[PDB]
Amino acid sequence: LNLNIVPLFEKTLSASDAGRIGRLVLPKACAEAYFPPISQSEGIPLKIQDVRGREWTFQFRYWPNNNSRMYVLEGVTPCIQSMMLQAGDTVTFSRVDPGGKLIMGSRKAAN
Amino acid sequence: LNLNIVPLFEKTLSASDAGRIGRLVLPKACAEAYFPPISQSEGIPLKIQDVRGREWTFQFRYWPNNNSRMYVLEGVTPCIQSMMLQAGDTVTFSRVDPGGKLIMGSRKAAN
Amino acid sequence: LNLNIVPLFEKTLSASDAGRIGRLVLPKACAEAYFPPISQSEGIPLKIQDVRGREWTFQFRYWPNNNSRMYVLEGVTPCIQSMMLQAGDTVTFSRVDPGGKLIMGSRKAAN
Amino acid sequence: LNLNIVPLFEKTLSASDAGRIGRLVLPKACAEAYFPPISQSEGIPLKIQDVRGREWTFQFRYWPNNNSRMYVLEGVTPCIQSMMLQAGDTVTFSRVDPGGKLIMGSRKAAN
DNA sequence: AATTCTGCATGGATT
DNA sequence: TAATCCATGCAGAAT
DNA sequence: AATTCTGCATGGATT
DNA sequence: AATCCATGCAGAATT
DNA sequence: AATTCTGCATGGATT
DNA sequence: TAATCCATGCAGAAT
C-alpha cells in the first residue's frame, strides 16, 4: 500500500464566503465533481481535516437556484478564522487516495 | 479503512535552513520522536507531499556533534524554492495513517 | 487555580501492544476504574496528552470476549514511538486535577 | 532520558482575555510562581508550544499597579482564536522536561 | 586558481 | 557552575 | 478623517 | 481595608 | 421590539 | 444574444 494526495479544487473567498454568515459557496462544477453527489435539499454533512489534523465539520448543502442548484458549505466560520483568513484569499481542497479522504489547505493573496 | 492525519512537529527556518546550502536542521527531540530511527550517519531517504500534490524526496540524516547527534534534512532547495519559503517562515510536518505517509505544510512569517 | 498530577496505573507493553495494528490492551479493572464508562463496544473517542505535551485522540473501545470484556486504545503507535517505548518498557497513565485530564507517560525498563 | 509533564496552573478567560486586545492577565501568584522572573516593565519574549506542536511567541510583561505588579502575555489574539476559545473557557500551562518547555492547552466551558 | 560542496566543530543561548 | 542544543563557522575534498 | 496601542488607573469583588 | 484582577480610559501612535 | 439566522431570488459576470 | 454561474440582497423565521 502507498497513498497519494490529489488536489481537487480551489475557491477564492468572496466577502460573503468569508465569515459572518457562515457559509461558503462552492463552485458547482467542482462541488458535484469532487464532493459527494446529493439530491436531498439539505444535503449531507462533510468532515475534512487540514494538514495539521485539525478536523472540521461543515454541512454540504444545496439551494435550489432557478433550474439547477447552488452549493454551499455551511458552518464554516470557525474554520476560516480559527485559521485566521479573511476575504479575497483562497481555500483549497485535496484528497488522499486510496480512501477519498478530504483535506483542505489555504493560500493567502499573492501580495 | 478510515485515514487520519496527526501533526508531528514544526521548524522555523533559519538563514542556513533557507540558505542556498540546501540543508534543514531538525530539532533532535523532534527527529527521534517523529521521524524513523536511523542508525548509520548516512541517513535514509524520506518522501513528503504537500497539500497541492508536490512530492519531495529528502535525505534524513545525522552528524556526530559533541557525543550526541545533530539531525538534518538534505536536499530541501527544490522544496524551499518551490513553496517560496524564506528565513523565518515555518515548515510543518504531519503524518497520515495507516501507512505512515509524511506530509508537509508551511506558514509564512507574521511580518 | 493550581494543578495536581495523580498516578493511576501502569502496563508493561506486550509484544502485541502498539506495532503494526496499533492497539494498546488495557487491564479491564483499570479501564473501568479510570476511563470513562462505555456501554457499546464501539467505544468513544478519547483525548490524552503524552509526556511531551502532545495531545492525541485514540479510540477507547472493547471487544466482548465471552461475558467479560477486553479493552483497548487504538491509534497508539505514533504516540508510543514518540516516547521511545519498546516492548518490555512501561506505559503509564496519570490524571490531572482539577479536571481529570488523562496523561499517558512512559519509563523504560530496568535494563 | 526521563520524559515528564508538570502541570503548572490554569486561568479562566475573561472577556478581555478572549477579546481582541490580545493581552492575557496572568494571576500574579502564578506568573511569579512559574514563569521566568523579570525585573523590568518592558517584558521578555516568551515561547509557548501548543498542544498540537506549533510554537507561539507572546510578550511576557508586567504593568505597575498600585505598589505591586500586574502581569500579562501580549499577542494572544491569534493563538486564543486558534483554539476556538472565548470568554469563560480555560487555558492551562504545563512544563515539559527535559528542556523546561512551556505547553499551553485549553478546555472549553462546561457547555 | 578560486568556488562550491561535505562533514563535522564551535560557541552563543538557554536550561 | 555544568550541560545541552542548534545556528552557523570553517577546514579539507571537489568542482 | 477613526481605530489600535499603550500604560497604566479604577473599581467591583472577593476574603 | 486588603488585595487582586477585569476593565476603563485618556493620551499617543498609527490609518 | 429588534438583531440574528435560513432559504431562497435577483442580476452582474463569465463563459 | 443566450445561458447559465456566483456574489449578495432580502423577506418570513427564529431566536
UniProtKB/Swiss-Prot annotation, chains A, B, C, D:
Expressed in flowers and at lower levels in roots, stems and leaves. It comes from the Eukaryota. Residues 9-110 bind DNA. It is found in: Nucleus. Interacts with SNL1. Transcriptional repressor of gene expression involved in embryonic pathways, such as LEC1, ABI3, and FUS3. Repressor of the sugar-inducible genes involved in the seed maturation program in seedlings. Plays an essential role in regulating the transition from seed maturation to seedling growth. Functionally redundant with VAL2/HSL1. This is B3 domain-containing transcription repressor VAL1. The gene is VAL1. The chain holds residues 287 to 397 of 790 of the full protein.
